[PDB]
Amino acid sequence: EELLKMWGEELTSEASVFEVFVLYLSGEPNRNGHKVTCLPWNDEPLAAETSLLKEELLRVNRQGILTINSQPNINGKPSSDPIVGWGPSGGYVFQKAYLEFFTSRETAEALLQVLKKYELRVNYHLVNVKGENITNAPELQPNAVTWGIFPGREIIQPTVVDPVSFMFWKDEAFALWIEQWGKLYEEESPSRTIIQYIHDNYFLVNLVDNDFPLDNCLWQVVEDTLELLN
Amino acid sequence: EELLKMWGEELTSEASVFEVFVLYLSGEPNRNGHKVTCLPWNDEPLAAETSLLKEELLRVNRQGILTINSQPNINGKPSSDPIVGWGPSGGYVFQKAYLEFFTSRETAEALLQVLKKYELRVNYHLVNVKGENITNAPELQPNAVTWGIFPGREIIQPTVVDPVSFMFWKDEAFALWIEQWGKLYEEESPSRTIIQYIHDNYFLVNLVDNDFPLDNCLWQVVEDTLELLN
Ligand SMILES: Nc1ncnc2c1ncn2[C@@H]1O[C@H](CSCC[C@H](N)C(=O)O)[C@@H](O)[C@H]1O
Ligand SMILES: Nc1ncnc2c1ncn2[C@@H]1O[C@H](CSCC[C@H](N)C(=O)O)[C@@H](O)[C@H]1O
């Protein structure tokens, strides 16, 4: 009853879903006065590194690019930074920019068309519930996205985007629609209709911008998809 | 006969050894008109990254800090750079500054005294033929000194300074004096005296500055040792 109170008692349209993600990312309550304190993929409030890319995420989600995971790029910041720092003291820490999101088939086709402009810079991975796995991943090999350099030590790379492990995550990612939000609504409801439509027709998408020394391209990539579509 | 022609037919003093290293590092011939084209540890001309730190090495060796291996610090330069670049195209490549050298016991004690000022920033390792291994190495663990970040890929760290492997290199490093320069001179020669003295009384020393984003400290560390000594 508390989940169904924050995610809306009944969805009017896709817009309702778009708002549930925008109200998770902003601090604002819905029209009923309740904050979206979690989503099926998160169960938590955001980690503090998202403070670096909040407005951007607001803008992206307001369009229907439904982000479920993210990362700022970090260019060798002090390992003591309370926002991004980790590991032993006196080192440096690094990140690639990363974005994980669901999309409509229409927006997925517009994104595949725009990713031709960014092919070598951005690793991408689109998939849907029937398969149709599309990725530019080198030989289906991991991509490092977080690492740290520490005094007297080897490099530590704690975090990766593996195209093989993503295909096990896919099975959670799409089933968390029906199993935790669909089964929350009535069987025959237009709400269930909406959620079953999103369970079937949407693409899960992952992007990684490999140029961590530069400004993040992923926001311009999505602006370029909304240009092409609009 | 060709080695003994370039390393000098007979050493007057330690100064003679100091000059053989300075004439390896500069392009200049000795007083006899012959270039030092190699040393016992190298068998080759320098790699092009030394162009970035030549004058510095000239200055260091002119004092008796006999460098046998070195590296500039590199802060995420294009992986396509003909000087420093390596691996797949479109990535970034990184280095810590590194210096490997022999020293007199007097200069080794002056360096141990000055390394107290740089303790956390500079990894150091001194050793001599009897043992007397001194290092600040974390739990006797490797230190990364070269690495690269490439699109779609994990980090590659091709090059390390391992405090355990250094103790196998030690046995070459000191024996290459007697086995390739000492046995080049006569048995009873003052030249053999000189080389046996350097085979026994000198310390092999390795330093690594871990702050690759900053200007290299190692040159000021050696200036600080020549201040203390002088
Ligand atoms: N709905 C959502 N949209 C965008 N980002 C989200 C999100 N829910 C969680 N996140 C973010 O996803 C990230 C998980 S942590 C990612 C790993 C970490 N940056 C590393 O350094 O290895 C956090 O920043 C979290 O705030
Ligand atoms: N006598 C000497 N003094 C100082 N440096 C030397 C030297 N003889 C060789 N070198 C240097 O030692 C280095 C060996 S290559 C070191 C590894 C490489 N920089 C990496 O990126 O992993 C070369 O730069 C070479 O020019």
Author numbering:
A (entry chain B), B (entry chain A): 415 to 644
Provide the authors' own sentences about this structure as they appear in the paper.
5,10-methylenetetrahydrofolate reductase (MTHFR) commits folate-derived one-carbon units to generate the methyl-donor s-adenosyl-l-methionine (SAM). Eukaryotic MTHFR appends to the well-conserved catalytic domain (CD) a unique regulatory domain (RD) that confers feedback inhibition by SAM. The catalytic domain (CD), composed of a TIM-barrel fold conserved across all species, binds the cofactor flavin adenine dinucleotide (FAD), the electron donor nicotinamide adenine dinucleotide phosphate (NADPH) and the substrate CH2-THF, such that physiologically the forward activity leading to CH3-THF formation takes place. This CD is appended to a structurally unique regulatory domain (RD) via an extended inter-domain linker.
This is highly analogous to the SAH-bound MTHFRtruncSAH crystal structure (Cα-RMSD 0.536 Å), with respect to the dimer packing arrangement, as well as the placement and orientation of one SAH molecule within the RD pocket. Beyond the RD, however, there is high flexibility in the linker and CD regions in our locally refined map. Our structures therefore reveal that the RD binding pocket undergoes major remodelling to accommodate either one SAH molecule (at site 1) in the dis-inhibited conformer (MTHFRFLSAH/MTHFRtruncSAH structures), or two SAM molecules (at sites 1 and 2) in the inhibited conformer (MTHFRFLSAM structure). More specifically, in the presence of SAH, LS1 loops into the RD pocket to contact the homocysteine and sulphonium moieties, thereby adopting a position that ‘seals off’ site 2.
